[PDB]
């Protein structure tokens, strides 16, 4: 029947959602890493003279 047509559309939409979540997660993880490294650098900034 045409179950395969609706099942393929379903597969494509969920593929697109899963990929969009992966990339939204990738962006967030990148910002966390940057944030944590920045805190680490702030902590050891030398006082100079």
């Amino acid at each position: 029947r045409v179950e395969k047509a609706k099942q393929k559309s379903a597969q494509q939409e969920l593929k697109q959602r899963q990929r969009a979540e992966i990339y939204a997660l990738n962006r967030v993880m990148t910002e966390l890493e940057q944030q944590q490294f920045d805190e680490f650098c702030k902590q050891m900034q030398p006082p100079g003279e």
Binding site: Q11, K15, Y23, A24, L32
Partner: protein, 248 residues
């Protein structure tokens, strides 16, 4: 368990999907917070599918390389904590070329080894380009790290394709007069970030035959950096570069 046990690609099953999110919660301090906001959003930015680059027959190789690297960049470095493609290094080339094709179709973030496989796949069509893996083993604080890039040689000059969090551990223009200088540019980068270089593994040039069944020779040369002299180190790299210049 590979992310793609359900062979093929996306979408993955729930068991795999939840496992990725449980892992996110263990490596990020807010853990579940980030997942709540993404999994709970009813719309999320649309991420274009990066299009594999096409060339004019006349386009010079250094231009092709820029665009191959620009394509590899667009997939983005994988910060998610979950490795999406399983890559078995002792595996016939043609089977690694199938994997590369799927990476181009699924279009998910990648790390250094994926980038190397992709690099080979996207330059098999350039017969005047030599490709060969370069692996580094370094030490930083109580741990050993491994990184790999695709060394390339065009018109007697060396460069590299790859992926890293650092701009100076991946792409290099084909401008280095010698293999020792290419490798030295990576040693400088590792110096900058405080890693101690322990080993360099150089493989043989990789066949351009997308259907080859030979597996990649990842450690034709292994250079133990501490035990070799700086001068014997450079002589070893030049020996390997000669050995490669002969098998053509």
């Amino acid at each position: 368990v590979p992310f793609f046990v359900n062979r093929g690609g996306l979408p993955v099953d729930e068991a795999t999907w939840e496992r990725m999110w449980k892992h996110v919660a263990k490596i990020h301090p807010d853990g579940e917070k980030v997942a709540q906001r993404i999994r709970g959003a009813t719309d999320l930015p649309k991420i274009p599918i990066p299009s594999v680059p096409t060339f004019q027959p006349s386009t010079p190789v250094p231009e092709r390389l820029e665009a191959v690297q620009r394509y590899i960049r667009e997939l983005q470095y994988n910060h998610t904590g979950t490795q999406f493609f399983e890559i078995k290094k002792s595996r016939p080339l043609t089977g690694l070329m199938d994997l590369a094709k799927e990476m181009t179709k699924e279009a998910l973030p990648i790390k250094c080894l994926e980038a190397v496989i992709l690099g080979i796949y996207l330059t098999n069509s350039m017969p005047t380009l030599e490709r060969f893996p370069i692996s580094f083993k370094t030490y930083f604080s109580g741990n050993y790290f491994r990184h790999i890039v695709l060394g390339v040689n065009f018109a007697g000059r060396y460069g590299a394709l790859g992926m890293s969090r650092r701009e100076d551990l991946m792409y290099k223009p084909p401008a280095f007069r010698t293999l020792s200088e290419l490798v030295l540019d990576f040693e400088a980068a590792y110096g900058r970030c405080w890693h101690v270089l322990k080993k360099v593994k150089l493989g043989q040039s990789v066949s351009h035959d997308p259907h080859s069944v030979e597996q990649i020779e990842w450690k034709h040369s292994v250079l133990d950096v501490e035990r070799l002299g700086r001068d014997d180190f450079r002589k070893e790299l030049e020996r390997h570069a000669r050995d490669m210049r002969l098998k053509i």
